[PDB]
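Hi L.,

You mentioned the student needs an example of a multi-chain input paired with its predicted structure. This one should do, with 1284 residues in total across all chains.
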Amino acid sequence: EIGPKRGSLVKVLRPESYWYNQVGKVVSVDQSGIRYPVVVRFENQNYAGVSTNNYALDEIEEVK
Amino acid sequence: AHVVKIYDTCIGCTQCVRACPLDVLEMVPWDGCKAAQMASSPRTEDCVGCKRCETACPTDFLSVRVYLGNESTRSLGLAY
Amino acid sequence: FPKFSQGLAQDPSTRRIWYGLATAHDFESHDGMTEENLYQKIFASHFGQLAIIFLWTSGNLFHVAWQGNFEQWVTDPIHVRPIAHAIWDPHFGQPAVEAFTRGGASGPVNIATSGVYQWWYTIGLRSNQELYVSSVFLALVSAVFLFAGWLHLQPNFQPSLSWFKDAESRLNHHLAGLFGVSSLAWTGHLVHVAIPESRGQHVGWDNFLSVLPHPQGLTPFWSGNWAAYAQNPDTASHAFGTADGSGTAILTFLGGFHPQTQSLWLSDMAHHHLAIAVLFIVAGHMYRTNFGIGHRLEAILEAHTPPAGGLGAGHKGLFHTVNNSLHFQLGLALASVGTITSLVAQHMYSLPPYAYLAVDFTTQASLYTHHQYIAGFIMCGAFAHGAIFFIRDYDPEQNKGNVLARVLDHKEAIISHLSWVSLFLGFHTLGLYVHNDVVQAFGTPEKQILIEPVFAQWIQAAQGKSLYGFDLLLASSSSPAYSAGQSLWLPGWLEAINNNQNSLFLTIGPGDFLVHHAIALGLHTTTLILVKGALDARGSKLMPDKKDFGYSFPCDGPGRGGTCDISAYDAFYLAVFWMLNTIGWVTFYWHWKHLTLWQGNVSQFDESSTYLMGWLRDYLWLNSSQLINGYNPFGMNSLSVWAWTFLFGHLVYATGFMFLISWRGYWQELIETLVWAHEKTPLANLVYWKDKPVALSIVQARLVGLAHFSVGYIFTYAAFLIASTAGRFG
Amino acid sequence: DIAGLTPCSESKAYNKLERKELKVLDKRLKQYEPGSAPYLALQATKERTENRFKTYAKQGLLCGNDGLPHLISDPGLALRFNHAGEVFIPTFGFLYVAGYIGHVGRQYIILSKEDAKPTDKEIILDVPLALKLAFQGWAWPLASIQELRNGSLLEKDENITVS
Amino acid sequence: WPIVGQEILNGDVGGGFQGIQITSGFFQLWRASGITSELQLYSTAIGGLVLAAACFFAGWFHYHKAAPKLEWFQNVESMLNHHLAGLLGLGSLAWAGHQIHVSLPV
Amino acid sequence: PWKQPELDPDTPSPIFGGSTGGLLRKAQVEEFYVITWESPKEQIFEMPTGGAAIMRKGPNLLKFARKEQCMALTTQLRSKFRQTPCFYRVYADGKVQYLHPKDGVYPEKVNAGRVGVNQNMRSIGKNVDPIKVVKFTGSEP
Ligand code: CLA
Ligand code: CLA
Ligand code: CLA
Ligand code: CLA
Ligand code: CLA
Ligand code: CLA
Ligand SMILES: CC1=C(/C=C/C(C)=C/C=C/C(C)=C/C=C/C=C(C)/C=C/C=C(C)/C=C/C2=C(C)CCCC2(C)C)C(C)(C)CCC1
Ligand SMILES: CC1=C(\C=C/C(C)=C/C=C/C(C)=C/C=C/C=C(C)/C=C/C=C(C)/C=C/C2=C(C)CCCC2(C)C)C(C)(C)CCC1
Ligand SMILES: CC1=C(C/C=C(\C)CCC[C@H](C)CCC[C@H](C)CCCC(C)C)C(=O)c2ccccc2C1=O
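Structure written out for the whole complex:
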């Protein structure tokens, strides 16, 4: 396994993101060398209406 | 004469390409994503600045940005 | 045509013409720019604004001396009206020239409102010859500055960049010479010339060397008996022109006003600008410049860092930030100048510095509104030019941990705690006015919530006002603060403040209470709009990178729910509406409170200013009677020019609503239709534009509509202010 | 007295304003008959007006030269000169009510967010829960200082920032 | 009603009565038809509530229970025939009956 | 495509009476656009400028003054009638340029021949501040 576990909650660390210092469920993780593999899903929508986004390994950290 | 730059976070949705009326954007292969696709902006001389491309990108923050700049006849949408 | 920008010149539309003017004096964004060429082009341009100032002053002197009645005004200053400039309008009729020739002059004229007559008369000007000689002097000084802006741009005489970034030498020369020596010389003028001209003696270039200011001369100055110059002050029964009731003093500390001319004593103002010269020369010798002694600016900022870490690194890294950022230096200057401009307004009406200004009711008003409206415009620029610093000239890595980054870190707290104060004052102030509007309306004027401003009345009692009866230290004879300054300033000061026929510390009631709080609503919420546009200039959650786009851009599109009016330019744009509203309340409150004083019926303001129908009935509707009848169907008075202007502002104000409400997309489709007609018409099609016609841009319309808005906001009130006060003459 | 204000009992303009406001009704009362309902309505308004003026005088209010009562805000002068009920005491009567509304809404928000679908609980309220909290908030200042001294009032840098 | 202030609005209208002055022209309408007493106005009000509930009842009936088809709506030529003759024609004829038989003599 | 199709400037046009949204003096002087497609039957379609027109069985040709007017029609034909249009750009000098299916495949489908342009290898944000580029143009490039 390369990254966090399925169904595990993680905290985001992108300064650009609407979900920054916020928590979301890990939907999936790809192990094929992609730059932004970690797929995360949040309950709260962003300004557009999207509730998912692919984040990186360094950009996510353990909850709270 | 507008500027269109696409960033590393593209995932090959093609929704930016479908939305642009003026055919500024096209898809090119790439090894960074699952879909193995990436956008491109070869012909920005025909860009107009509608920002429908930015509206369709589903990322957390946009993989496509239209940085407005100097104007022209094609950019101002002048039939005359 | 723009040579400084090739990107706009290639534009075929009319957007080239408009944007070429607005980006003209924005040297940073120009093509082929350099930091060294930037400072030089500024240094040359700043010579230009001086050239227009000294010429603008020369025009007033000439147009007054040639066409005015300065010689006739000095003899009877109270009754005679001043004259600004004559009139030549061939579209007049015979009734108008007969009405506009109210002055003693032959032809029609315009009555002045600035107050230059009271100013020139005070400093010792008593003839039209002396104004002709002066108008030539400034026109020469004006030409000299134009020659310098060209000279100091040449290949030689071209200052280097290190010369501009020498702060320690600029402070010492400007604090000591520009401020101090200039203030020292002005005292030299008041002593050698003006005070004699008050006491009858004619002093001029012919006889200033032979005439002594004091009988003893300078021998007291060297001996140390400096109190000899304050021995025989001018008596109360003293005419300002003649030697009846005169004295020999040149420096005195009498305090208070002169009885006949309700104005400050000249001997005091002479003594004033002397002490200011001493402190400012002393402060000029502070910083270090080419000698061993002196302070350094960078060493000070690095030192004032608190040990515990309440401010982190503290003021470190700020010297290179200020010295290299021109927008930072401009924000502090405007914020300082814009505040001073309000002091000039607040401290002149209460302390008249000129002769026969308290009697000229129309002149006091315009001088107050003129400076305060300028104080708002200037102060809105400090934040705006302060916001541009965060985009262009801010480096986070250099300014890390310092006060400037620690402010920007927690900006969500500042903008939030501000919003509480605006909401708090807004609900509770309006709720009381509306509570009083209603309860007046049901016939019960006793149920109003009238709260007395006790804290302000506590001050006036602590500053000599014995009406309220608090019996504070300086209203009490036993206290030391009364004992100290008893021989110096208090007999003249206590007489004036306790007199209820001057504007010095007017009586306060519950009507004055609500307005000072309503004024607080303006400043705290106007600051909110401008502070937000500054701190959120670099980025927002809706637009994480505003810094890449610029200070002024229309929007980021309809996506993300809509992004209209996000840029920092659009924050400044919205604040000007609040700047004008705030200054309007401040200025409405000055005019009405003074009209009731001048009309003698102070009870009008105290009882009617507690509910808002009083403002609409007793101030606006009532005082707009003589004005509105400027041109009646029966005839026309001299106030016709003001009623015409009064509508002219009610119209310009409305035309801006077009550019504000109706936006571009409706119009560009319309211009496309006129273009079709111009080509399909048989003969007009032979003519063809050189530049393609297009509608005005988005940002341009916000600017244009704000100009049509603000100009009507000003031209409307200026007519009402002058016409209401001039027609009643009180 | 204080601030050069006379009490409302001793003022002349205060009684002048009473004689005026009653004269309007007496003139209006002349039109109608004695036993009619318009007569009874105006007589009641006359009775209320006479009661409004005497009660404000009895309460040690301060009337100015205009003849209208003025309020004092500093608790020092209010307590010294017996004018506390005007401003100083109602300040605490409000804040008790205002904090009641915050302590209640804050608790409904926290508790609904501990369950599934909190969005539905806002548009479709749990009225049994809302009434329970609304009758449990009589002692909200105790819970606040309990929650402050404990540290479970404020969140700690788990909030979104923008840069 | 007599609570805080708010009774001064009941102005001295005249007629042993005080209240708000209306500007809707109902009094002149009720006089153009024969209406001399208040009892006629009460009955007219009770009729409206009765007819209004029927109109509300019909909206439920003609949607929730027995709703027409698209064919019934597209019969456009029958609407004009019924809505001209029946509604505007007989409705004006009926009012003349009220005018002729009641309003004129009163 | 296999090869760029050259322009046939003499093909039948649809049956359209005319309108006022046509071409202006800009077309003869600067440039104009023309679109081609091939229909299997006679149908009716909405024009971008004006009203309705009747296509013709076989090749069809229009002339427009804007690229958006042409691509607006492609989106209608590709969706409603499921056709494959192709449009050019004609200058005043007579030069002709083949624009939209420049590779033969529409842009929303990948192809191996294409090469990326204006591709930054970084995340949005994560770029230098304007102060670093204060005296020349560009923070994004
Ligand atoms: C008795 C011990 C004592 C005390 C009380 C102080 C007190 C102070 N020192 Mg100090 N100092 C001490 C001993 C002490 N010092 C010693 C022994 C040394 C070694 C020599 C120093 C060396 C030292 C240095 C070198 C410096 C200080 C400074 C300061 C000042 C600011 C420090 C700070 O954290 O800002 C307080 C922290 C804040 C974060 C500010 C909060 C701002 C509020 C929240 C804003 C509210 C605004 C809002 C609009 C309010 C409403 C207003 C409305 C009514 C109009 C403060 C007055 C600094 C100074 O001179 O600056 C003045 C400084 O640079 N100290
Ligand atoms: C008379 C016109 C008017 C009024 C009343 C306001 C009021 C306000 N503006 Mg505003 N504004 C106006 C014109 C006006 N503006 C114009 C022309 C412009 C230029 C575009 C702006 C630009 C502007 C900006 C840029 C900003 C504001 C802000 C504010 C708020 C300041 C905080 C405050 O004091 O709120 C309290 C004051 C009030 C008067 C509250 C209004 C509500 C009262 C109590 C009535 C309550 C309703 C009542 C119960 C009946 C409702 C029934 C009905 C629903 C059926 C406030 C809501 C600032 C803001 O929102 O920051 C917080 C802000 O940033 N305005
Ligand atoms: C109590 C009887 C009853 C019941 C249980 C229902 C139940 C239903 N109806 Mg039905 N209906 C009824 C009576 C009833 N209807 C009547 C009497 C009529 C004739 C008007 C209709 C006409 C009707 C239509 C035409 C439709 C329904 C629909 C529906 C369904 C959706 C209900 C909904 O959205 O709630 C809405 C809940 C409300 C409380 C609505 C209140 C609206 C009132 C009238 C407005 C009041 C005006 C206000 C006082 C003015 C002041 C405002 C100011 C700003 C001016 C549901 C099966 C819809 C359907 O089939 O579902 C798709 C549909 O399209 N009904
Ligand atoms: C010491 C004073 C001072 C100085 C040296 C500068 C210098 C500068 N400012 Mg600044 N500014 C100031 C005060 C100052 N400002 C004040 C007080 C304000 C607040 C109002 C502003 C608000 C401000 C903004 C909002 C912006 C600048 C900008 C600029 C830059 C130049 C833009 C340019 O060329 O515009 C040239 C513009 C024009 C020639 C158009 C002005 C036309 C005016 C509005 C019309 C006036 C009405 C009309 C004539 C009335 C006639 C009456 C009629 C009845 C006859 C430059 C760095 C711009 C900048 O840096 O961009 C990044 C910018 O966006 N300034
Ligand atoms: C003694 C030497 C000396 C003097 C007199 C000056 C004087 C000046 N320098 Mg300067 N300078 C000096 C040495 C000196 N410099 C040195 C050594 C350097 C190199 C380090 C510079 C570098 C330098 C630069 C780079 C610039 C200047 C500029 C200026 C001008 C400022 C603009 C202005 O008019 O403000 C006038 C200000 C006053 C007269 C006094 C202060 C005003 C405040 C508000 C007080 C108000 C008092 C009172 C209430 C007013 C009442 C008015 C009455 C009529 C009612 C001014 C003429 C600027 C310039 O070139 O402008 C063209 C500029 O950009 N200086
Ligand atoms: C009970 C819920 C609640 C609570 C505890 C708070 C708490 C706060 N708000 Mg907030 N607010 C709320 C709801 C709430 N808000 C709602 C619904 C709105 C939209 C109208 C706002 C809009 C708002 C603004 C615009 C601002 C605040 C601000 C603030 C802070 C200062 C207090 C203030 O200015 O009050 C202001 C209060 C109002 C303007 C109106 C509040 C609406 C009612 C009175 C309360 C809501 C009750 C709720 C519906 C009941 C649910 C009960 C449940 C059992 C069913 C404080 C942290 C200020 C801030 O930025 O912090 C410094 C500020 O400027 N509030
Ligand atoms: C945003 C920004 C900016 C801006 C700023 C501003 C604009 C500011 C404002 C502010 C202000 C504009 C301030 C003001 C101040 C003032 C004050 C603070 C004063 C006070 C005073 C006092 C202290 C006094 C005292 C006294 C005496 C002395 C005597 C008598 C009594 C008394 C007590 C009164 C800048 C550029 C920096 C940049 C960055 C960003
Ligand atoms: C006011 C009101 C009301 C009431 C009333 C009503 C409205 C009534 C009704 C009405 C009626 C009461 C009606 C009736 C009518 C009738 C008719 C319309 C009849 C006529 C007839 C005809 C049509 C003709 C006949 C004939 C002849 C002549 C010849 C031969 C035979 C025949 C048959 C053909 C209500 C409550 C409801 C509502 C509200 C208001
Ligand atoms: C009317 C209108 C137009 C069209 C207005 C036009 C084209 C008028 C400008 C051209 C006329 C000919 C200039 C009129 C001359 C001025 C009275 C004086 C100008 C002085 C300057 C030269 C200094 C817009 O383009 C627009 C754009 C965005 C929002 C609102 C609007 C809007 O309201």
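You could point out the following to them. Residues 35-67 of chain C form the longest helix (33 residues). The CA atoms of residues 439 and 445 of chain C lie 6 Å apart.

Best wishes,
N.
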